[PDB]
Amino acid sequence: VEPDAGKATWVAASTYGTDTTTGEEVKGALKEIHFSTYKLAAKSFITDET
Amino acid sequence: SSESYETIFSQRIIRDLQKELVVGALFEELPMSSKILTMLVEPDAGKATWVAASTYGTDTTTGEEVKGALKEIHFSTYKLAAKSFITDETEEDAIFSLLPLLRKRLIEAHAVSIEEAFMTGDGSGKPKGLLTLASEDSAKVVTEAKADGSVLVTAKTISKLRRKLGRHGLKLSKLVLIVSMDAYYDLLEDEEWQDVAQVGNDSVKLQGQVGRIYGLPVVVSEYFPAKANSAEFAVIVYKDNFVMPRQRAVTVERERQAGKQRDAYYVTQRVNLQRYFANGVVSGTYAAS
Amino acid sequence: SSESYETIFSQRIIRDLQKELVVGALFEELPMSSKILTMLVEPDAGKATWVAASTYGTDTTTGEEVKGALKEIHFSTYKLAAKSFITDETEEDAIFSLLPLLRKRLIEAHAVSIEEAFMTGDGSGKPKGLLTLASEDSAKVVTEAKADGSVLVTAKTISKLRRKLGRHGLKLSKLVLIVSMDAYYDLLEDEEWQDVAQVGNDSVKLQGQVGRIYGLPVVVSEYFPAKANSAEFAVIVYKDNFVMPRQRAVTVERERQAGKQRDAYYVTQRVNLQRYFANGVVSGTYAAS
Amino acid sequence: VEPDAGKATWVAASTYGTDTTTGEEVKGALKEIHFSTYKLAAKSFITDET
């Protein structure tokens, strides 16, 4: 996606709704936005045969 | 393929289910269906409904008499779209449970943008906004609290403008009040503080909003610009003033292409929220001056 | 269609929820079957109705004794109606939701002016008006206040008048108070609290009204004409002094014309304000003279 | 509507996508057009049931 950065949302549609400034305008954007993990992890050393 | 028509009733229904910001995001809602709901009516302004009608009756001043009325009581709408796709192009190596992972955030962006357009706003494309309303209402007579620092965090402000709108409407149903966080701490957990906002439920009892100042629940919601000058109040009765001609049941416009490394799910909303009468809201005031 | 018996119901239930204006009237609303109701009894404005009837049967003073109270106990209510009319042309658009959201205001402003009449009205077209009936009992006896130049009476007058219908009003069950909002600002937010004014919530207990002296719930405003020469107080035992005969359960008729494409409804009401005996409210003055 | 002036009744549709001078056009005009009608009084009666 584009970030939640810079907007300012619509002119709600008619003639030339802020048609001189601006457009897009800053960032914005498209980061892009990739994620995964670290397979996070735990372990418990104790005495287990007894 | 998804993202065209498979989860929509989903989004409208959860948007019903968090249309839920107790600040303006519920009001006097008209689930509308006309484009412009227009009428030319003359409500509670002028009459003198019945009067004795038997002897003399309306013969000198003034005829109309004053307002009136007319507006006309048009009710258009405002187009509250969003427009955030993601690229479904190669982001598709079996995801699909991203459809139960992606969404949600987007109507959150909707409703926050919706409220901040709602309380301050111009009528151009939004409705005209409620904090800006009090500005064009000048409902905002200063001073009553001294401008960030040694602020007389009282309620005689409140009482004065309370009967002033009780000159307008009546008293204590609802009468409401939206505050700042500066007014949140400035009239929560000060001393007295005030009339009543200790406790801050304040019972809770009623249908629901935090605080109750003789019937005035306390809305922070944090859109007042601080800097000593704004209101830090919103003295209005809700149940007089302003309705919501709320228009459309939302369809997303999950449009496919939009190609070359992208897709297109524009989203939507259409409501309107409209002044019912004359001057029925006050605020602050408290300003820098 | 609409403008029909189908929509008087959401036009008549407004009476049920807003006969409930706690601003000027509370009585035993008599449910009326006939119309010109009347009893012929002489109420107990002299009785004394046994010594036992004993070895003596009260033969000397007096012979009736005094009045009486043969008025005789008449009743004759009053038609009360605004003319209602909607845009009886434009909507063939089946809005309907409309006339809900359009009015509930006609019963209301109807009731607003109705209570302007109730507090203040010379008896015809209206029934009884309070300050007009107060304008015969010398309720506005001279004087108590000092003509809008720092007026000083606390509940001092209230103690005096409290004695003055400490006469056959007992105290504080019911016996209530209306003041003015000018009186709400010259006395509420005084320091007094003279037994109470401030804060007068004072729990908030059962139904009650805004502010309180001595237990008495308190209304203000408007329909009290200010101008220093007034009752800026209104004290009475409601229970003894005055009652509501109310006859006409609500009819509005949604016959059509009324030409020029805007048709005719009428918010008909026959209720009545009536009492019994003699002087039952003393209140003001409080003069400008 | 896209207004009378401002149009640009022709755009080139073979050359550049409105850049230099300029493609908007100039001023004006503007009024939010809307068409709700009015009634006119003329309703009459004459020497009627004669």
UniProtKB/Swiss-Prot annotation, chains A, D:
Segment forming the signal sequence: none
Chain ranges passing through the membrane: none
Part of the whole protein covered: 210 to 259 of 458
Entry superkingdom: Viruses
Described purpose of this protein according to its UniProt entry: Major capsid protein that self-associates to form 120 hexamers and 11 pentamers, building the T=13 icosahedral capsid which about 860 Angstroms in diameter. Responsible for its self-assembly into a procapsid. The phage does not need to encode a separate scaffolfing protein because its capsid protein contains the delta domain that carries that function. The capsid gains its final stability through the reorganization of the subunits that takes place upon expansion. DNA encapsidation through the portal triggers capsid expansion and the binding of the decoration protein to the capsid exterior.
Subcellular location: Virion
Oligomeric and partner information: Interacts with the decoration protein; each hexon binds a single copy of the decoration protein. Interacts with the portal protein.
Protein name as annotated: Major capsid protein
